[PDB]
Amino acid sequence: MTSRDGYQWTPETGLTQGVPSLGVISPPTNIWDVIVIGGGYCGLTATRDLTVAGFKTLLLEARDRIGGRSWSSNIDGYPYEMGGTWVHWHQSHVWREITRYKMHNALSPSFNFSRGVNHFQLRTNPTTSTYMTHEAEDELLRSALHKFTNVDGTNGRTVLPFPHDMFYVPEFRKYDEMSYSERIDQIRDELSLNERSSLEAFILLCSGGTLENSSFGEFLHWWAMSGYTYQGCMDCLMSYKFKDGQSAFARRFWEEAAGTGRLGYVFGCPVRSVVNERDAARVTARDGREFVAKRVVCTIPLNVLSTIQFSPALSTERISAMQAGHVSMCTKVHAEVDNKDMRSWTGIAYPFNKLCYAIGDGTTPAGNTHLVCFGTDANHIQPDEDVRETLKAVGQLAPGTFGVKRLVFHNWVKDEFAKGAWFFSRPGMVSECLQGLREKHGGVVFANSDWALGWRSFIDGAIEEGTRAARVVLEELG
Amino acid sequence: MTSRDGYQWTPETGLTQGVPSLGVISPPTNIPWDVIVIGGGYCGLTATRDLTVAGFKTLLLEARDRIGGRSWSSNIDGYPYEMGGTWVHWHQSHVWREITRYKMHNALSPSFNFSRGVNHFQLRTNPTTSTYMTHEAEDELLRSALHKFTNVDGTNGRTVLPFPHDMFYVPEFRKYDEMSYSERIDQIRDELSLNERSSLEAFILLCSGGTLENSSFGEFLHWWAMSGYTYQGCMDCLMSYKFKDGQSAFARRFWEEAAGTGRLGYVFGCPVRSVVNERDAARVTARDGREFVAKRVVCTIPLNVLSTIQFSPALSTERISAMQAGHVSMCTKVHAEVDNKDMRSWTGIAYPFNKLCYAIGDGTTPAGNTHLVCFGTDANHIQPDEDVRETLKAVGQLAPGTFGVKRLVFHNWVKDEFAKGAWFFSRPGMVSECLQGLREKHGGVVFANSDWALGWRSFIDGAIEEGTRAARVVLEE
Ligand SMILES: Cc1cc2nc3c(=O)[nH]c(=O)nc-3n(C[C@@H](O)[C@H](O)[C@H](O)COP(=O)(O)OP(=O)(O)OC[C@@H]3O[C@@H](n4cnc5c(N)ncnc54)[C@H](O)[C@H]3O)c2cc1C
Ligand SMILES: Cc1cc2nc3c(=O)[nH]c(=O)nc-3n(C[C@@H](O)[C@H](O)[C@H](O)COP(=O)(O)OP(=O)(O)OC[C@@H]3O[C@@H](n4cnc5c(N)ncnc54)[C@H](O)[C@H]3O)c2cc1C
């Protein structure tokens, strides 16, 4: 079935809105111990866990589909990943779900250097290009990232030995309070233009924000989780994806919860308020429908929380977090291109372009190279507003080398049920707000990847929180 | 309470058998069944936990007087001595998931602590001399040796084994599973110094628990790939972080969750001898003769113990081959509470002349003394219970004239009829040939064990991976 989310473009058709996805459900309602608000991976995991354990559970979702910030669209036999894509066995919670659902052998490597141009193209201004082996690329980045992360002599292993517990070493704090910008000023004189351009594009790829509004320490956190090495990051952040797309993975959570016969659900159901009552909680949609359950697991994203009325009011720490917002404003654009040899191309174009990092990520059934392109708040584009400028930004990644057959993207920034992409914090925000984002609220359990402990902001972190949310509810009732 | 497993030695008390463990279940029973789970190790504990929480009436039948199997801890004078499986990391999916779900992510200790004391690595290649080194220099030497050992494909195994969960993804990988440790060393011999080769062999033998000749090179590549294809990755995953309250506190979490569903039946001290599949049901018979019936059976008995069990209908050709050959890990693990405070920051390799080859300062008891953990392998084997003097000699040769022993603690895994080996490690070619047969349906018997996991095979993680698969399979109803 075809979702309301997403955009597609071809030369023949122009820009159309709405694309297919297995995430679309399916019949939109089939209508409690528990209400779960939101059906991304956090909500899916909580719901799966709770229904399997014997609770009647109602899932309320604003969209016409499951998956939230992660979901895929099969177009002409090719899964286009609209948001969260990549997974790895070094990621505990997603991996456990992958193997339990027997999908550990249903993955593809995004990188294929076995034919074609097999180079990295670095663009530091609009006129000119630098070419490089992928090896040389790997090494440009290791060298840059070593300097960026070596605040303690051990690339973070001393100040953050236990990433799950940021205050184990009291001293990590100053790094959470530091911006990318402040860090770079410290190591500046020691970086070439090539190292710095590569480094800035890489760290901003990770934050989706700006040099000034991105927490250095949050990046140290990603680095630490990944093995405190550049190759560790690439393995964990960008190497392996589902062959059948993230939506086939979300479906497995959905099918299991449904198979218990304890699942109620409503889609197209944007929640407007959550009010604690005597021994229960009442959730009301924008259109006035009301639902009641003993406990509510609320998985609305940080950047959307300020749209909801809660009673009692949320705590002071929750309020600051949501008013400030996280900074990831990532624009992600897929491009089906007519250059077959670009399967093995990668490119960084920084800082002049609105898309700054792109990779050949696959080959469609039609035989065309698929490129994925990323842009950040550093030089922002809204990919839907002016196709001409979006195309010009894709092309500038490799001027004069290809024509575009198709674009596919979803706009996360302008999307009212996301308002941003994956979580990334401002300097000081996690230090300050994480405990609060995570604290009790009577009968409401706030659970989201945005405030995970481990792979925070990742599909993994959604699953971690989701599991934690089910466990809390279980303990409180039973 | 005190288990019958394990041993303790002090100058004052001699050698005593039996040591405390929170893993001991008292009382030893609380008794139709949907599922019988044979074995209360991490694999049995996971499958039972999952099955009972999901609503199944489950009977757990365990040979020992305790849970944990090849992993369990003993609190002696307020210190947890890890008798088997010890270390965990967040790059191990299954164990970590259980740790965070049980909220024990913040209940870990670092084994390594280089912040005071002798702070050096001691390498011994003959009984009369030592070579002293910094920890940095130690890391460097092993990083260099291991780079040469693993660089079969130009990228330290990343090309031939990109998805360790699927070993045959690259068909070229098989030839390496069929190689032995010694086959690979001989290929690079002329490029390794004594110090590089001594360190290398000690490290790779530490991982296999067997000999140069019977350890699969490919299987070491599998551990290497799971850890991140680096030496630091291996250290992080293999030996860095342990539970501050001991592995047995961790297993008790699976137990209490299972117990509190009210759907758990159990019999400790109950060794099984036979499992026969009947019509839509299956019958399990103890040694004493007790019979149990359930619709399906999850059997978590270790590979090396399986041939003691009698199955009907009979197991397949590849299962039989696997259980006759047996895995090679004959690891000896001996704890020494010693009187040298400065050895907190010590590590040593003594190879190949000593019966314990690898050892580390691993903590400090509440009494104030250094805890050393020592390993030996089938390359130069000691049976630590058979003669205390010989065991003290082995310990003392890791660093002669530097300490007196106040206490030893250990369990003999090799002479344990319910393990008959330590963690799984394969012979050349065994995993290629046998894995799938070890994984395969068997009527109403589902065989599950760390020994035949896909990812962290032979690890606690692998037990949990397998226990999880086993609970899922059972439905199926
Ligand atoms: C472009 C992009 C790229 C990414 N890259 C990766 C990657 O490579 N790997 C990775 O692991 N992660 C990646 N991420 C991270 C991302 O996948 C998230 O961290 C994760 O999916 C969040 O899941 P969640 O369940 O915590 O929240 P979400 O997925 O946002 O789900 C919660 C949402 O609650 C619903 N909701 C919101 N408001 C309301 C309301 N008012 N009423 C009812 N329901 C409401 C949303 O519609 C429902 O889907 C990426 C994300 C994006 C956007
Ligand atoms: C010395 C040592 C050090 C190790 N180091 C580490 C480490 O640092 N980190 C790590 O992750 N792993 C380590 N390992 C790996 C190890 O802990 C195992 O891989 C894992 O614990 C096996 O779990 P399992 O539940 O699959 O099997 P087990 O725990 O072996 O299986 C459960 C067992 O089945 C029972 N049983 C056997 N026969 C019968 C019978 N006839 N009837 C009834 N019950 C029977 C056993 O008594 C019961 O406990 C180590 C192991 C050892 C021995």
Curated annotation (Swiss-Prot), chain A:
Q: Per its Swiss-Prot or TrEMBL entry, what cofactor is needed?
A: FAD
Q: Where is this region: Disordered?
A: 1-23
**Reaction catalysis annotation:** a secondary aliphatic amine + O2 + H2O = a primary amine + an aldehyde + H2O2
Q: Which UniProt keywords apply?
A: FAD, Flavoprotein, Oxidoreductase, Peroxisome
Does this entry carry the keyword Flavoprotein?
A: yes
Q: Name one GO cellular component term.
A: peroxisome
Pfam families in the cross-refs: Amino_oxidase (PF01593)
Supply the enzyme class, top level.
oxidoreductase
Quote the EC number.
Answer: 1.4.3.4
Q: Where is the composition biased (Polar residues)?
A: 1-19
Q: Name one GO molecular function term.
A: monoamine oxidase activity
The coiled-coil segments of this chain are none
Where, subcellularly, is it found? Peroxisome
Task: Report the InterPro entries cross-referenced here.
Answer: Amino_oxidase (IPR002937), FAD/NAD-bd_sf (IPR036188), Flavin_amine_oxidase (IPR001613), Flavin_MAO (IPR050703)
Tell me the first and last residues of the signal peptide. Answer: none
Task: Name the predominant localization.
Answer: other
By sequence similarity, the record places it as follows: Belongs to the flavin monoamine oxidase family.
Query: Can you say what this protein is called?
Result: Monoamine oxidase N
Report the source organism: Aspergillus niger
